[PDB]
UniProtKB/Swiss-Prot annotation:
Gene giving rise to this polypeptide: ALKBH5
Record text on subunit structure and interactions: Monomer. Interacts with RBM33; promoting desumoylation by SENP1 and recruitment to N(6)-methyladenosine-containing mRNAs. Interacts (when acetylated by KAT8) with PSPC1; interaction facilitates recognition of N(6)-methyladenosine (m6A) mRNA.
Organism: Homo sapiens (Human)
Outcome of mutating K154Q: Mimics acetylation; promoting RNA demethylase activity
Shown segment, full-protein numbering: 74 to 292 of 394
Purpose: Dioxygenase that specifically demethylates N(6)-methyladenosine (m6A) RNA, the most prevalent internal modification of messenger RNA (mRNA) in higher eukaryotes. Demethylates RNA by oxidative demethylation, which requires molecular oxygen, alpha-ketoglutarate and iron. Demethylation of m6A mRNA affects mRNA processing, translation and export. Can also demethylate N(6)-methyladenosine in single-stranded DNA (in vitro).
Domain topic, free-text comment: The C-terminal disordered region undergoes liquid-liquid phase separation (LLPS) for the formation of paraspeckle membraneless compartment.
Cofactor remark from the record: Binds 1 Fe(2+) ion per subunit.
Protein name from the UniProt record: RNA demethylase ALKBH5
Effect the entry attributes to changing P55A: Does not affect interaction with RBM3
Active site: Y66
EC number of the protein: 1.14.11.53
Keywords carried by this UniProt record: Acetylation, Coiled coil, Differentiation, Dioxygenase, Disulfide bond, Iron, Isopeptide bond, Metal-binding, Methylation, Nucleus, Oxidoreductase, Phosphoprotein, Spermatogenesis, Ubl conjugation
Amino acid sequence: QQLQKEEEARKVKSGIRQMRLFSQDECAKIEARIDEVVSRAEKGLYNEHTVDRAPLRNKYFFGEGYTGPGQERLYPPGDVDEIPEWVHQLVIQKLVEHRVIPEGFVNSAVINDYQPGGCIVSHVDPIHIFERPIVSVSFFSDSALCFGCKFQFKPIRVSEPVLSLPVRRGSVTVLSGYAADEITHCIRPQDIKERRAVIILRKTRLDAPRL
Ligand SMILES: O=C(O)CNC(=O)C(=O)O
Ligand SMILES: [Mn+2]
């Protein structure tokens, strides 16, 4: 049981790469742009499916977005707004330059914006929708990304995740293999003490089922 948790954590770690790529100034500039997105959404300037509002977490879908169990679908072409130029210029370019992902890979950029006490429940990034690797960049504050999220449903039987990964402002997280496909991830509400935002950069699959 203890050996099993250590083996799983080793497997999770084999599919995680992390690096501090964005300076405090670079973060400040990107954070200003994220604020612009929030403002534009509030002004009703985005397409219908670009904005997903939920109690303590908003999602903003660019390039491609998605919606019983395990049957998410891509919205028809042109339903979501295009990836903003600043995302290419300030975020994707930096990633390509540092050999994190190849040029042309990213066709989907999602911004998650969290209130204090916000969270995201146990999930796997839909395997029928997105290629791997999955890249994420964190912005306003530091937090943690948990892996193996049974604890969110069975706190008596299991109190802790398999692994908790610190995700600092300006850090890039790359998920692949076991970490992206074989285990769930989540964020605990106690780990978001102040506003936090994340830009998730992915490539959708050719055969991603569409509406
Ligand atoms: O906010 C984060 O760091 C993680 N968010 C997600 O896992 C997601 O939107 O798929
Ligand atoms: Mn996810």
